[PDB]
Amino acid sequence: KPNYALKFTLAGHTKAVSSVKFSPNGEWLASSSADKLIKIWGAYDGKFEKTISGHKLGISDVAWSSDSNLLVSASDDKTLKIWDVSSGKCLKTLKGHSNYVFCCNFNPQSNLIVSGSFDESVRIWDVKTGKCLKTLPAHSDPVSAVHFNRDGSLIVSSSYDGLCRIWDTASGQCLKTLIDDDNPPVSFVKFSPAGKYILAATLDNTLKLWDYSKGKCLKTYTGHKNEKYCIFANFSVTGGKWIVSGSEDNLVYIWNLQTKEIVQKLQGHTDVVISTACHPTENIIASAALENDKTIKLWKSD
User: Fold this and answer.
1) Its Gene Ontology molecular function terms?
2) What span, in angstroms and rounded, lies between the C-alpha atoms of 61 and 22?
3) In sequence order, what are the beta bridge partners of 183?
4) Please, are residues 298 and 10 in contact by the beta-carbon 8 Å criterion?
5) What is the spatial order of strands in the sheet that 296-300 belongs to?
6) What is 5-300's CATH number, 2.130.10.10, 3.30.565.10, 1.10.3670.10, 3.40.50.2300?
7) Which residue, 222, 221, 181, 227, is CA-closest to 202?
8) Is residue 156 a contact partner of residue 191, using CB atoms and an 8 Å limit?
């Protein structure tokens, strides 16, 4: 079992936090908020670095490029923005979604961005030109998450329509639809770090690990509360092999990936824990909470 202990609390956002992500190089934490801002923090000391501004409405998601040089953000202003983190410059504004942009990610080569929207589409954009390469008529309700697999040849999307879909990046073809024995909204999905599996959250208090090639649910993680919000979940890989998630009872939950047992709950937030992130090299978790709390917490384990 891990022994995550609170090390730092990061105050600065003026509304609900929406996402936290560690830079791949381990140096930084990026946060997005309903306050329309991105903040950068030191990953190891929690020290505030700077604010990246320009969205006109709240931000739902932010993601790093694989070389830690760029961020992409998804906003209710119906845009994504590509940011040079060192300069703070907005390199490109990606316009084309017809409603709120909810989710975003770079591909592994950080030459493409994928986005999902309340407009029920998935878009694929060229990083260097900022132009949209493809629009996928992916879902019949808002798209909650989008993620590329380990070589960028596939995208997984999740939706409030109750589906996860896997797309061919090059053709835009729908290769797979995954759904279990009930049809609750899907609030999050991502590929596993080696890409054998997907991890999906549904708004029935359930995380599931799927073998997407076989189309089978292999594991379920339960015990937390998740019926309303799009709560990210993580694979923790630096020490023990864990699943990490926020929860609507204001806790961070940590499960054993193999056994599905709860191994730790982290107490301290005063509102829903909307987002968690796992440091790429150190046993460090970042957690972030909604409007009644507005803080980020850094936790560290032996």
Assistant:
1) histone H3K4 methyltransferase activity; histone H3K4me1 reader activity; histone H3K4me3 reader activity; histone H3Q5ser reader activity
2) 13
3) none
4) yes
5) 5-10, 296-300, 284-289, 273-278
6) 2.130.10.10
7) 227
8) yes
